[PDB]
Structure 1
Amino acid sequence: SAKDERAREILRGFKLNWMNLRDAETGKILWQGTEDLSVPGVEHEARVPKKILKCKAVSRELNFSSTEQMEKFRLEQKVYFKGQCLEEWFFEFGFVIPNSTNTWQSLIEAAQMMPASVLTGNVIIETKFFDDDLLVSTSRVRLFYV
């Protein structure tokens, strides 16, 4: 398909350079990393402070570069606990200039959370990156709450 070829081209030109997460109330930085957690086909791991589970909302800064132009870059993301999706989020970035580097800010709302001790190692966040309806990649991060 021209569409599958196009998906592979966008993925080939894409890199997530760095990402931060903040308490949306505090503005305090809770986690940061420079590892591209969006790379597909390998299970990524992340160690995050357990106090993040007590935030009402978390603010994400995601810096990415893309050789390919995209009309409607967006994400759909799910939290899975032992295999079961507990919640889903949708975020839209929109147009991406070819060969651009971009910082995307998002406010992620928590929608009752189990304790960190129960969740740790048993949560996966699965993120699907799309351009409009074309699925570009699917990646997964297993979470440890410390």
Structure 2
Amino acid sequence: SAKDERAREILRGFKLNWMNLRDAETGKILWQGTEDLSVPGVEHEARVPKKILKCKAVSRELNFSSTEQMEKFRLEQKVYFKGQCLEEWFFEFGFVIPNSTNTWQSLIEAAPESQMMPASVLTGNVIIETKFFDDDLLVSTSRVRLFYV
């Protein structure tokens, strides 16, 4: 369909340049990466400080480029523990100018009434699956395996 072709074109022109994650309370950068974690069909790996699990809120700064215009750029993200979804997040960026480079800031909060398992239990058993959309059009699905160090 025209929609499937369009999703492939957006993926072709898309790149995640860098990303960092901060403790939202202190503003200190806990993790930073320049690997494009959005690339589909390969399991990405990331080693993060185990103390990030104790942050109630984590602030993300995601820098991306897009050759293609997007009307409603957004993400759906699920955290899986041994294949079971523990949590889901939705974030909306909106309009993307064709051939632009943008920095997107998000606040990722803990789900209320939930207790974090120890880092030693979680390490290597957590997969964060991210779906990139333009409105209801799925552009890509990528996965990151987490190690808490």
Alignment correspondent of 2:54: 54
SS of the residue 1:39 aligns to: coil
CA distance in 1, matches of 2:14, 2:128: 20
SS of the residue 2:9 aligns to: helix
CA distance in 2, matches of 1:94, 1:4: 20
Cα displacement (A) at 1:145: 0.1
Cα displacement (A) at 1:110: 1.2
Alignment correspondent of 2:119: 116
SS of the residue 1:118 aligns to: helix
CA distance in 2, matches of 1:117, 1:59: 23
CA distance in 2, matches of 1:25, 1:88: 22
Q: What CA deviation, in whole Å up to 9, does each residue of 1:25-44 have, x standing for no partner?
A: 01000000000000000000
CA distance in 2, matches of 1:82, 1:57: 23
CA distance in 2, matches of 1:28, 1:97: 30
CA distance in 2, matches of 1:23, 1:82: 26
For the pair 1:136 / 2:143, whether they are aligned, the reply is no
SS of the residue 1:35 aligns to: coil
Q: What CA deviation, in whole Å up to 9, does each residue of 1:51-96 have, x standing for no partner?
A: 0000010000000000000000000000000000000000000000
Cα displacement (A) at 1:133: 0.0
Cα displacement (A) at 1:137: 0.1
Q: How many residues end up aligned between the 2 structures?
A: 146
Say what the alpha-carbon RMSD is for the aligned residues. Answer: 0.2
Structure 2: gaps spanning 5 or more residues: none
Please, what TM-score do these two structures have when normalized by structure 1?
1.00
Cα displacement (A) at 1:17: 0.2
Alignment correspondent of 2:41: 41
SS of the residue 2:38 aligns to: coil
CA distance in 2, matches of 1:137, 1:80: 18
SS of the residue 1:41 aligns to: coil
Q: What CA deviation, in whole Å up to 9, does each residue of 1:4-32 have, x standing for no partner?
A: 00000000000000000000001000000
Structure 1: gaps spanning 5 or more residues: none
Q: State the 4+ residue runs in structure 1 displaced beyond 3 angstroms.
A: none
